[PDB]
Symmetry: D2
Subunit: 115 residues, 4 copies
């Protein structure tokens, strides 16, 4: 599991369940190609997006579909989605945890990078 996403809801003090996450990788022609996608579990975690073999060096974008999440709760939020863009594995394989904390008008994101 070299790439894991964890999403929390700051309004309810709970994991953010069933949030859609789409991951893209920047291709040789500077286009974002689809890489992986999934939905957060009841623990607000998304595991198994990729493998070490497939997760090569590159620029990745993790798009978290926050708008759909808040709308399904009857809240009209500010952002369309939360986007996290980073270079990965540029000095060898690392494990990446991307965490996001969500509110209707704000969000925070962090990365925990281990090896």
């Amino acid at each position: 599991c070299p790439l894991m996403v964890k999403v929390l809801d700051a309004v309810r003090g709970s994991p953010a369940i069933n949030v859609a996450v789409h991951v893209f990788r920047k291709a040789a022609d500077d286009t974002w190609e689809p890489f992986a996608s999934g939905k957060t579990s009841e623990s607000g975690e998304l595991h198994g997006l990729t493998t070490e073999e497939e997760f090569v060096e590159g620029i990745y974008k993790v798009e978290i579909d926050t708008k759909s999440y808040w709308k399904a709760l009857g809240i009209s939020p500010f952002h369309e989605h939360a986007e996290v863009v980073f270079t990965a594995n540029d000095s060898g394989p690392r494990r990446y945890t991307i965490a996001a904390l969500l509110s209707p008008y704000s969000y925070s994101t962090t990365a925990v990078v281990t090896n």
Copy 2:
């Protein structure tokens, strides 16, 4: 005015208005003595808490009554209040707080 407080609401995307703020300074006996207080304005700001003369080096606590704020909006919050504790050293302090029911963040902007 060397100390300013700004409070924002992350749920509504607005200044947090009418939020009570109490400032304390740590006394000789390790007690917190009341120092300054007020309620944030329409812009979520609290200006004029103190003066350069009075704002001597020391340890200060800024207590933001976040519970009352959320209760007024009909939302059940987690925290009793938010506290920011820091040392003022000489060499302007903006204490900002961003509020959600189960989370808050605070940052200090120290300028000049």
Copy 3:
């Protein structure tokens, strides 16, 4: 000026100065077209990006070049940049970003 950007540095407790910001609007073909840009001032602020006439309803992206900022301070950052994507609907927008090497937070303050 219906759109303002403010950027703060959580490592140094200061405005984030000289940070390039690019604003894009989503075009008819789902493309991002350049809309406005600038560099934050000494107060970490970027004013005068647009006018009420030009700032029509639509989807906008604000891209903050956080990587260059951290590189200038000799700190290796995680993110390529920070992006804030939102719909402007009619019924002033302050987009604030708080920057650390491996983390950032952004909040919108929508007033009037």
Copy 4:
């Protein structure tokens, strides 16, 4: 484990290891009495502070000793510590995760409350 603390470092993108945490409970005479204390592990987590039996209703304060953490890294930080104060178990036992994300001039805290 009804009370867990997790602390992350936003400067290094790593868990915050060896951070001291002191927990207090408000006593009948409105004094803060010591309740539990510990240090975060290599994963930035602190488990085993208390038991369900001991963790009764009350107002608790979780003090995270952030100043010592940053000083040991050669950074002179703004805050003396981060404090999280909350009523616990007021409608029955809950499990509380207190998370903090740390930077020298800022911090964020969240609670995940489950049952």
